[model samples]
Each structure stands twice: as C-alpha cells, then as structure tokens.
Target: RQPPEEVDVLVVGAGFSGLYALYRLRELGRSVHVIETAGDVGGVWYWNRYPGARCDIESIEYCYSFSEEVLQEWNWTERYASQPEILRYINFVADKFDLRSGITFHTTVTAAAFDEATNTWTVDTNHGDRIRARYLIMASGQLSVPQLPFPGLKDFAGNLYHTGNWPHEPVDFSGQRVGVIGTGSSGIQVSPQIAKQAAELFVFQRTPHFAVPARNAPLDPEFLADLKKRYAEFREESRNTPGGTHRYQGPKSALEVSDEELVETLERYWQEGGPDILAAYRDILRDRDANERVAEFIRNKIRNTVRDPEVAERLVPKGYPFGTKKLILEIDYYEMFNRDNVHLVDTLSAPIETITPRGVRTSEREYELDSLVLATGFDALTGALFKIDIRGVGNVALKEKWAAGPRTYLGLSTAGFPNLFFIAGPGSPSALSNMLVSIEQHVEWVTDHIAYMFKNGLTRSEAVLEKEDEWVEHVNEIADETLYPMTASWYTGANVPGKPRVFMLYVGGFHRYRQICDEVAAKGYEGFVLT
Candidate 1:
C-alpha cells in the first residue's frame, strides 16, 4: 500500500485521442500525465506495423489540421500513407509539441477506482504503481486490442502474428508459405502485400467484403499546393461534412437523377476513388432499392477485375447494405487473387477447426504454412476501456455495470463513472465518420466541459442515470431508423464472439450530433451532475 502519486489529470492511451488530449490540456495549463502500454507515443500507429498496412484516408487530410504550420511543414509521399509514414508523422508531432516528457511509456493502468470522498480517481498500474487524479480521461482507442482466436494459439510451431499488434522489425516471408485468417480491413490490406513476398498465401475468409480500389499514388504536388491554399475552407468543410473527408459534394438523392445519370455519377466517383464514392447518394443507406443499385454496381466492378468468377462472387459482399460495415479501400486486393501464389479459403463454407504445428485445419481440409497471421480485428468500441478494471462509486466494477452492453451519455461520459470521460466511445458518431475529425471534436468538447467545471468552481462531473438511459435510447432509435443495425458489423460488436450485441456508434450525421452536444452544454451542462 504505497501512497498514490498525484496529478491534475490522468490520460490513458497514446493514440490520436490521447496525444491531442495531452496537448490541449497542457495548453490550458493543467498538470497532465499520459500512461501508455506501448514504448512510444504513436498509439495505434505504434502497434499496427503489418506489411502493406496503410490508411484508407488520403494522407493530407488524415493528419492534424489544427496547426497550419504542422500541416504545411510535414509532407506525405503517398496518397494513402503506409504505417511507417503515419508513425513517423505521429513521432514528429510528439517531438514538435514535446509531448513525450509528460508520458509514462510501456506502462498500463490495470484498474481505476473512483474515491467519492476526495472526488479523485485512484489508478493502479500493472508495474505496481498507484496514482490519484482529479479527472480520468480514457483516450483508449476504439480498436486498440487485438482479438486472438482459437485455443492453444501459442502451441503452434509456425510463426504467429496478430495484425493489430505487429512486430516493429521486418518479418521476411520470401520463399515461405503464409496463411492469413480473417478478411476484415487488416486482412484485406495485408493479404495483397504478403502475397507479393510469400511463395504462396492462403487467406481465410469468414465473410466477403466490398473493397473499392484505393487508386493510391504519390502525392500530387499540384493537389497538395491547392489544398494548402484552401486549408481554412477545407477544415470548415470537414466539420460540416457527414463522413468528414471534406472532399465529397454529391447530390443529396439518387432519385433526383435518371438511371443513366445515376450510373454515370457512380462511375465518376468509382474512377475518382476512396470512401466518398459510397457517400455519393443520401438515399443509398435509406432506400433498399437505391442501396441495391449501388451494391450491384460494385459487384459488377468486382467481376470485371477478378479473373476467377467464383472468387469474384466470394469477394462481393451480399449480407449488408453498402455503407453499413466500414467499406474497405484496397490496392489490387480482389485482383490479387488472380496471382498464382494467392488462394482464398471461404470460412463461411468451411470453417477453420484449429491451428496445427505446420498450418491450419478446416473441417474438410488442411493447409500447410510457414507462418500464420491473425487479421481478426479489435474488440472495438468498449474493449480498450474494459481492459482496465475501472470501478465507480461503492467499488461497482465497470465490467459488471456493462455486462450486457456499454451505456454512455453523448459517448463521452457514462453514468456512475464520475469525472471519467471517453474520447470517442459509444453514443457518438466516431466509427461512422472520419476518425481524425471526430477525435478533435470529442477532445475539444471534453476539455471545454472540464474548463467550465473549473470556472464554475465544480469539483466532480457525472452523467445522471436517467439522462444516460435517455441518451442510450435515443442512440438506438436513430440507428434503428437506418440500415446500420441491419448488418452484423463491428459497429454492433457482432464481430467478436460472446460480446454484447449492441450498436455502439451513433448513426446520426456529425452536424446533428454536434448540435445536440452544443445544446446540452449551453443548458448549463444538462444531464450531468456537477458539484
């Protein structure tokens, strides 16, 4: 029982949210300490270094737009930045702002218990350290934890790697056979890259994904110059846009145009490339018929590119609406199957049984490999927070409270978790929109609220139980009204086995969510108990 170290604020994780939270709070002259599990301050970028892993968003727009000097100073080589480039950018930001000095790297908070008497949180780390802070910020990312499937995974003799938590050093696959499990975003990105290096690559696919061509290339100097010139307008436009990419501006409805015109519009977007193509029509996510047209359009494109008809059919997603799941951006992903070294095993048709010393075993057959890569995505939304044993008033464990599902007010504050805030948790438009924009919005809102509490001489802030319940209901109501809940995607925590099947992200547009948050703040932080 050592005396707890003290600080004005305790920030968790070192990802985009954590870094920005520290930077902003520091600017406000608050004594903040950031604790991260990784040895460095890149957060997700620090861990996800799998082959060919790159961001789907354009490099220029994917970065911090808060500082014009930062934006103009750093230059990206590729349209879609690879993991290494992104990590370098993050490191640059940390150095530029001198953020590393305030961070405790390679340390994780194992549990946090709120002490109502002192209005502070007692945090215990795995390395036998204790600390007390007035405010607890869970900058823990939505997709920080890697979900390793199957029993006795460690017993496998072959090299094993989780895409979410990749080795920092190079892993040579030359002349060796490789097997990749899970066809999620990570798998889609890594498979194609590994195929180039490995003698043979076997990809395990549970479900097919609709992947659009990334059309990634070197950053065009002209495009970069133009964007820099209009940086202010671009930032403003991103705030107003639905998905937050800031480049899209299509017609509101497909019904307004003729069938021929609709086809032409989709074609132009298809050629231009990126996620904005899916957001071409507002009705695409609302009307079944309209959505079908878009799905069929992408399917046709898949058939045209992939040489194998059967493989093409297996690659085109059919279960959900177009934009329901996070649409994938691929660089010759589907077409990569045409290569002689690549092979696809549809797990839906023949599920995997277990991993053998040599490779993997399915119900029908076995595939031998020199290495196995688990591209199974993260537990998402709540997994990162749940990792820490957080207890609220009367030692009520957060896990017990959220046994059924996660409940939060405005995706920032949860009931019973006084003075604890999540940057972009459930009930917010996080995964459904561009993450950088959403991250900035959530961080700013949380900081401003903290500022208000201090200005008003308030010590603790918590979301009222009734208000949290109402907000949760409103979030579900909005999601149910759209096609978001119709699919078994990670947004609903459906990807993880035994995870509470709940729709986590707010399906409402960013503008609307922002307005509601503003209105709530304007009303003296209604729905929150401040003392």
Candidate 2:
C-alpha cells in the first residue's frame, strides 16, 4: 500500500501495539496509518520464525482483550503459543478488523521532525514517502531490533541467521554442523531443536540465565469453553496484577520459611512447571538471601538433570540473583546436553574472538559449522527508536536525548516531544508485565488521550519537564530497591556496548501505573501542557 500524504496520527511498526493503535484510532474517527518494516503484521512473531520459537506467556493471556469477538471466536491449542500460531492470531485480528488497508507494508521511517509552528510531525520513510501528522505514535516495540555479537559476521562463509530476523522458509539443519550464540530465551528454545537434526550443535553461552520448565500441554476444549464465559472478567483480573498474569502471589517470605518447607513449596511449583515460581514467595526479588534460597533449589534441579557434573556446573547460573534477569521457560534445554551431538561452549571463560570464514573462533579454539545462528538478543527498550532519526523540539534527536537512558513520563510521552507517544517502551511497566496487557493499556490510553485532546480543541500535548524529571527519578528510586538494577541484563542496557547502564523500566506494578495514568487523564491531563 502507498503511504498516506497526511494523517491525524502516524504510527510506526505494525506489531501488537501498532495494530491496536490503528484499530482504536479508527474508532476515534482519526485518520491514522501505520508504517511497518515487515510486509505484514505480527511484529516480533512475523520476524522471529526460528525453529522452536514460541512465546513465554500462555496463549490465553498473551492475546488481545479489546475485542470480545476475538476472545469468543479464537481457540488456542497449546499452553504456550508457537511463533506460527501467534502470527496466525495476529493475522486473524488484522484481517478481522481490515487493519491491512490502513498499514503501509515494508516501509521504514527514516526520519521524523516536529514542526513547532504547525504542531505536526513531518515523517520521511526509506521509500521517500513524506507525510505530516498532528501526532506521532512510535509503536515500534521493545525487543524488535536484533544485535550480532561478533564483528566478522559478514565474513562468515556459511549461512548466517539471526533469530529475530530468521528466514521465512523452513531451514533444515539435517546433516549440518550449527553454532548458536547466546543463551537467552531464543538460544535456549532454538538449540534444542537444532540439536535434534544437526550433526553437531555448539551452543555458545556467555552467562547462564535461570530457566524453568514449561510443562506445556494442550488446552482442553471443555476448559476453554468454561473460561470463555468470564474471559473479560479474567482478563481484568490479570490487568490488575503486578506481573499481568494469573500466577499466585505468595504471601510468605522465602527466607522466613524453614528449609524443609521452602523445598516443599518450591518443589510443587517446579513440578507444576512454568514461570509462576518467580511470584511463589514475597521479597524473592528484593531480599538477596530469599532469592539465593530459591536459586539454590533451581541450581540443584539443573545439576541433577545433566549426567556430566562438569557440564552441569558450567550450565548453572552463578553470581546473579534468580528472577533478576529475564527468567526463561525451557522445554528440553537442559536435557539436550545429554545428547552426544549437543555441546555447550562456555563463552565467558573463553570469549568468541571473531567469526572466521569456517566458523566461530573463541579464545581457546574454533568450532567449524555449516550454519551460524545469532541469538545474541536485542539492544532492547530504546534500540528500535534509535534506528530512526527522530527529532523533537529544538532539533533534538531522541537517541541523543536518551543517551544516558530513556526518560519518559508514564512511559507514554516524553517532555520535549509534543504529541509524540511511545507504546510499551521504557519508563513504563512494559517488559515487566504481560506485553499484551501493557500494550493494550498503552494504546487505549494514548488513543483516548488523543481523542480527549481533539475534544478539548488542543493542538499539542507535552509532558511537563519537571514531571518527567520526577518520574525518571521515581523509576530509578524504585528500581534501586529491587534486584533488577543490580544485574547486567538488557534491562539495564548492559548487552549493548557503549550504551548507558541506567535501568529503563518502571518497576511499579501495572495496576498502580494504570491508576496514575487514569488520575492524570481524570484531572484534565494534568502534568501535561496542552495548547
């Protein structure tokens, strides 16, 4: 589709956030359109087609709740939706709402500048499509960008692939020697599948991350029917929680419990399987002793899984608190090591030197491979935005402004960028919560605010400088109290070299954040200057 000449709102990236933004804005009678680099919807899902690529969240909770029709209609098969299923769900929503008509596919926004006099954004795309809009909504997602760890990636002789930008066609690793770098979610999920078919699969691990078993099972039709009766109510309950899931919030502290009781409590959750164990005790993330107690139990589980003691010890995550870095849910990751074909190359002890024409070379030795998969993760929160040249008031670049780290009010709007909104980015309970829950809340709030501004005859809206400052301080203050800021994960922009080490998310629960946003809007959009 051709890019629009002008629109009331210009949304970038057609993922869950961008799609919802388009749908809601259309209801508000605003002429809105989306420009996505992908040919279609399903932002992250569409791009990440690696084998065993699946969502960490359950299928039921990971979808859109805005449409009761969608809830009543769509039937999910698995506990955790695979990438294909998720992409299908996204396509269903897009097609059902005719969202494709409003979206320009395979277009990237090159630069966007704010015109103060007109109070409109002039957006330019790679295709040379220039458009002006009153409001600019950046729905370009948190983990959209892929980062390669090595420098000689281009010099690699064989097929080089990134999990984030995987090839659409099915890749057969049969009779092939494959090397997968990084042990994040993607690496954990993918390596197991590759190990099955590849003659040799070397998984490069820098730092081991805590992983729980995803005892996934098929969703019974009877249970789905019963849940559908109060689906909206159930979703509302999820919206009100801290993690945005139905995981039980245990009342007892991890340290307070007796060692026997602690093992018993954790054993049940471990057997049940999934990431619910993170919330199995109070202060697991706050108190170091409490965290270590739970961490030891999980470490023992890992140590017992693999037959080789040295390999098992190498796999065990050390020096980091459990539930601090992104907790991964594995299907058969630890078990894969028992296979003769699979190998775990600890990169931290012997770091990767470079990608040779033959394969990846570490400080110790080189492992020859037919294919290389870079699951090195993303630059995270602000990475996607940095790809675009976004200039706000006074010709200030967003990348330069947020060089220290992302600074936003309520994670929706920044101070200097009037009428510019970022959905599910930093300064909010974005990656901290169920992304759909957070994304829906952000889209609705931003669209509602846009509608409110139109109703009030306002041309511009900006977060107050003082309020933004206070919010940034509050975000850091709360983060300092938790184990999140203590780790060198992507949450703190530690993966990307030369990036700021500041923690970039609002640790406050989604329920509380929603209330704050509601109060701001209820008070005629207080803490914002509307002209």
Ten consecutive residues with minimal summed lDDT in candidate 2? 147-156
Q: Per model, how many backbone clashes are there?
A: 0, 0
lDDT of 1 by residue, 225-273 (tens): 8888888688777878777776565666866778898889889988988
Error of 1 at 390 (Å): 0.5
TM-score of each predicted structure versus truth? 0.97, 0.99
Q: Return the top candidate by TM-score.
A: 2
lDDT of model 2 at residue 18? 95
Model 1 residue runs over 4 Å out of place are 1-4, 247-249, 255-257
TM-score of 1: 0.97
